[PDB]
From a paper:
In the case of N. haematococca xylanase ([name]) the crystal symmetry does not change with crystal size. The structural models resulting from refinement against the RT-[name] datasets are the first RT datasets of this N. haematococca xylanase. To inspect fluctuations in data quality and indexing rates, the run was split into 40 independent datasets, each consisting of 1000 detector images, and processed with the CrystFEL pipeline separately. Next, 1000, 2000, 3000, 4000, 5000, 6000, 8000, 10 000, 15 000, 20 000, 30 000 and finally all 40 000 detector images were processed together with partialator to assess the number of indexed images needed for a full dataset. Going from 1000 images to 40 000 images, the resolution at which CC* reaches 0.5 (the typical cut-off level in macromolecular crystallography) goes from 1.83 Å down to 1.5 Å [see Fig. 4(a)]. The alignment of all the residues of the active site (S19, W21, Y76, Y80, E89, Y91, P101, R125, Q139, Y174, E180 and Y182) is slightly worse, with an all-atom RMSD of 0.519 Å and comparable with the all-atom RMSD of all the residues (0.583 Å). The same alignment carried out using the 1000-image dataset, instead of the 40k dataset, resulted in a slightly worse all-atom RMSD of 0.630 Å. For just the two catalytic residues E89 and E180, the all-atom RMSD is 0.151 Å, overall the residues in the active site align very well in all three cases. At the same time, the [name] system allows for uninterrupted data collection without manual intervention or the need to enter the hutch, enabling future automated multi-parameter data collection for multidimensional serial crystallography. This was demonstrated by collecting 40 datasets in less than 30 min, wherein each dataset had good statistics and usable diffraction to a resolution of better than 2 Å and each dataset took 40 s to collect with a PILATUS 6M detector, corresponding to only 7.5 s using an EIGER 16M (Dectris, Switzerland) at 133 Hz. If a higher resolution is desired, longer data collection times improve resolution, i.e. recording more indexable detector images, with a sweet spot, in this case, at roughly 4000 images.
Serial crystallography at conventional synchrotron light sources ([name]) offers the possibility to routinely collect data at room temperature using micrometre-sized crystals of biological macromolecules. We show here the versatility of this setup and methodology by performing structural studies at room temperature (RT) of three additional enzyme systems of biological relevance: (i) Klebsiella pneumoniae CTX-M-14 β-lactamase, a β-lactamase relevant to multi-antibiotic resistance mechanisms; (ii) Nectria haematococca xylanase [name], a highly active xylanase suitable for industrial applications; and (iii) Aspergillus flavus urate oxidase (UOX) in the presence of the long-lived intermediate-like 5-per­oxy-9-methyl-isourate (5PMUA).
Residue numbers in the entry: 5 to 193
């Protein structure tokens, strides 16, 4: 049992996905606001609001993020030609989502140092189907649940490590959970 929901709401692109619809509730609210509540330490989900296509934009977000276990809060998006999946992790719970990726330096932006990582996913699900694509990570050391993200500064930093970003696909502020519980209300702009 899986459920994936995308579209435009309040003037913003939204995307929600889970393999357990009964333990996660995603709620579209006005403008770029969305809420997600998950319980029972069962299921995997990713949801949030943003843009399609993304861009080198300044993403402003604010709200409340209350994970209890494996969960992360991140700007999350894709590019095409080349195929790239990227994460700007602003906060996370008991697991660093970067684990397993290769260290690739630091970048200081938006009031904190971010640790950069790169990784390759081999014959894995992607926005274009099963592909081999590159991953870029920026993990904030000073975890926060509100502020501004200069995406261009990470796009520039990543381009000095490996292949440069291609044409943008979707770009959202995502709340994620993996067999955990929590609640979150965020508003992007």
């Amino acid at each position: 049992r899986t459920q994936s929901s995308t579209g435009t709401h309040g003037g913003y692109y939204y995307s929600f996905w889970t393999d357990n619809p009964n333990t996660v509730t995603y709620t579209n609210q006005n403008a770029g606001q969305f809420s997600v509540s998950w319980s029972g330490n069962q299921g995997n989900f990713v949801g949030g609001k943003g843009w399609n296509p993304g861009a080198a934009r300044t993403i402003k977000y604010s709200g409340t993020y209350n994970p209890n276990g494996n969960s992360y809060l991140a700007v999350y998006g894709w590019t095409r030609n080349p195929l790239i999946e990227y994460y700007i992790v602003e906060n996370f719970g008991t697991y660093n989502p970067s684990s397993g990726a290769t260290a690739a330096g630091e970048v200081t932006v938006d009031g904190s140092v971010y640790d950069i990582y790169t990784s390759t996913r081999t014959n894995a699900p992607s926005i274009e189907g099963t592909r081999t694509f590159q991953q870029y990570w920026s993990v904030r050391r000073n975890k926060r649940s509100s502020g501004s993200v200069n995406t261009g500064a990470h796009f520039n930093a990543w381009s000095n490590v490996g292949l440069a970003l291609g044409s943008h696909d979707y770009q959202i502020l995502a709340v994620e959970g993996y067999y955990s519980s929590g609640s979150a209300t965020m508003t992007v702009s």
